[PDB]
Amino acid sequence: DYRARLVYPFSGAISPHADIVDQATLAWAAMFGLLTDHKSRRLQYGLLAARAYPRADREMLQIAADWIAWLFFMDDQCDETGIGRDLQRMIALHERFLAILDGATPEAHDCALTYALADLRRRLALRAPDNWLRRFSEHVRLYFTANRWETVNRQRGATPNVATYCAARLFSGAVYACFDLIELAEQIELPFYARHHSIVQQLEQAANNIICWCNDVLSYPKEMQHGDRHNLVLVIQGEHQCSLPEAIDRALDLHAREVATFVRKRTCVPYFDAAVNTALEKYVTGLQFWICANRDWSLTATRYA
Ligand SMILES: C/C=C(\C)CC/C=C(\C)CCC=C(C)C
Ligand SMILES: [Mg+2]
Ligand SMILES: [Mg+2]
Ligand SMILES: [Mg+2]
Numbered sequence: 001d002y003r004a005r006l007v008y009p010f011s012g013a014i015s016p017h018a019d020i021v022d023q024a025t026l027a028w029a030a031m032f033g034l035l036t037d038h039k040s041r042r043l044q045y046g047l048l049a050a051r052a053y054p055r056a057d058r059e060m061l062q063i064a065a066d067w068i069a070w071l072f073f074m075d076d077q078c079d080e081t082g083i084g085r086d087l088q089r090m091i092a093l094h095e096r097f098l099a100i101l102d103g104a105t106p107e108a109h110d111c112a113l114t115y116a117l118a119d120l121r122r123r124l125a126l127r128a129p130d131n132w133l134r135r136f137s138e139h140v141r142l143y144f145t146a147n148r149w150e151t152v153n154r155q156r157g158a159t160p161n162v163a164t165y166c167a168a169r170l171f172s173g174a175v176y177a178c179f180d181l182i183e184l185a186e187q188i189e190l191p192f193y194a195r196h197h198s199i200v201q202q203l204e205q206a207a208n209n210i211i212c213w214c215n216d217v218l219s220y221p222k223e224m225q226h227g228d229r230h231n232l233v234l235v236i237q238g239e240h241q242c243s244l245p246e247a248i249d250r251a252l253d254l255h256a257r258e259v260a261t262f263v264r265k266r267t268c269v270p271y272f273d274a275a276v277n278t279a280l281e282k283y284v285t286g287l288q289f290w291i292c293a294n295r296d297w298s299l300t301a302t303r304y305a
Contacts, residue, residue: 002217003299005252009263012292013054014047015061022046025065032116034073042302045069051293052178053286056185063123064181070116071174072303077113078147080226085154094144101137127184139177146171150230165235166209172230173215175208175290182286188279191272199268200280206262207287211294213255217248218304262291 015021025046029035049065056064078084083093096110100118103125125133149168153160160168170176183189194200216232223231229238232254237247269280298304 002248002252006214006217006255006295006299008259008288008291008295010288010292012051012289012296014296015050015054015056017058017061018047018050021050021058021061021065024062025049025069028066028116028119029069029073032119033112034069034116039302043069043072044297044301045072048293048297048301051296052290053181053185054289054293060127060181060184063120063127064178064185066116066123067120067181068178070113070120071178073116074113078150079223079228079230084147084151087148087151087155090148090151094148097144098141101140124184129189132180132183136177136180139180140174142171143174143177146173153230154228159229159235159238162232162235162239165230165232169212169216169230169232170205170208173208173212175211176204178290179204179208179287182283182290186279186282186286188282190279190283191276194272194276194280197270199265199270200283202265203262203269203284203287206258206265207291209258210255210262210291213251213258214291214295215298217251217255218298220248222304262287 022044023046026035026040026043029040045068046065049061049068052068053061053064078090083089093111093113096106096114097117100106100110100114100121103121106115106118121133124136128136146168150172152158190200213232220231220233223229224234229235232251233244233247236242236250237244240247240250242250266284269277269284271277272280
């Protein structure tokens with residue numbers, strides 16, 4: 001229990017719609033045939049989304065919850081089945097996803113994950129401009145690239161060094177794609193010059209590292225159980241040749257250090273104008289809601305028990 005070593009100087013919130021949103025995710029999952037088997041009521045994927053996007057209108061929060069569900073269903077295929085150890089099969093599947101992200105219609109014998117991604121594309125297109133769909137699609141593309149990088153590690157029995165793992169981990173988690181949904185949840189449109197400012201990129205990177213490293217500390221047990229080493233704890237242990245307790249200590253020191261980086265750089269956002277800065281503060285608060293949502297959900301979730 002590492003609760004006491006996962007403290008943030010900011011709190012999160014949860015949408016009042018959390019439980020109805022979760023039930024609507026199980027409907028969507030059944031409807032698209034993503035539920036394998038019998039236990040499904042303990043996935044609670046909607047309760048993650050409810051915390052990550054706590055001021056979203058119910059219809060946007062439902063897209064986010066179905067998107068988070070999609071990522072977990074995809075991720076357990078990558079991390080707990082043979083497709084995550086076969087690059088050729090991953091490439092074949094990612095080519096259908098990327099065709100669907102460009103707006104192509106699923107074919108009759110495209111898999112359930114393909115039909116479901118096309119549903120989420122269609123629904124995001126109803127709520128997002130073309131500029132946003134492009135940014136989101138490109139973040140999702142890099143997630144697929146990170147997933148294929150994991151597959152080659154699995155195929156080779158490789159373990160990357162800390163520097164390589166941390167840099168690839170920023171993409172393997174799809175957190176940048178989940179961050180794009182903050183704009184829709186908060187009904188904001190950041191101008192290109194604010195979106196890409198060095199400090200905003202450093203805050204996004206910081207927040208993504210925190211969410212991934214927090215996840216790594218809480219998920220090393222189940223990842224060890226599937227002989228998987230895409231985890232800061234296991235990668236530190238391999239690099240420093242230290243005890244599991246010492247690797248966990250080092251992982252949590254990196255997590256803590258990253259919280260410090262995020263909190264300090266929050267104070268370094270340039271003043272563009274009242275409007276832009278109000279929209280950026282909503283976005284940066286969004287990153288904080290995600291940081292809290294990841295920890296608060298993961299501590300209570302069957303998935304890490
Ligand atoms: C995936 C990024 C994390 C490791 C934890 C935060 C969870 C999500 C952003 C949605 C679920 C996505 C998975 C790839 C598990
Ligand atoms: Mg996983
Ligand atoms: Mg994974
Ligand atoms: Mg994990």
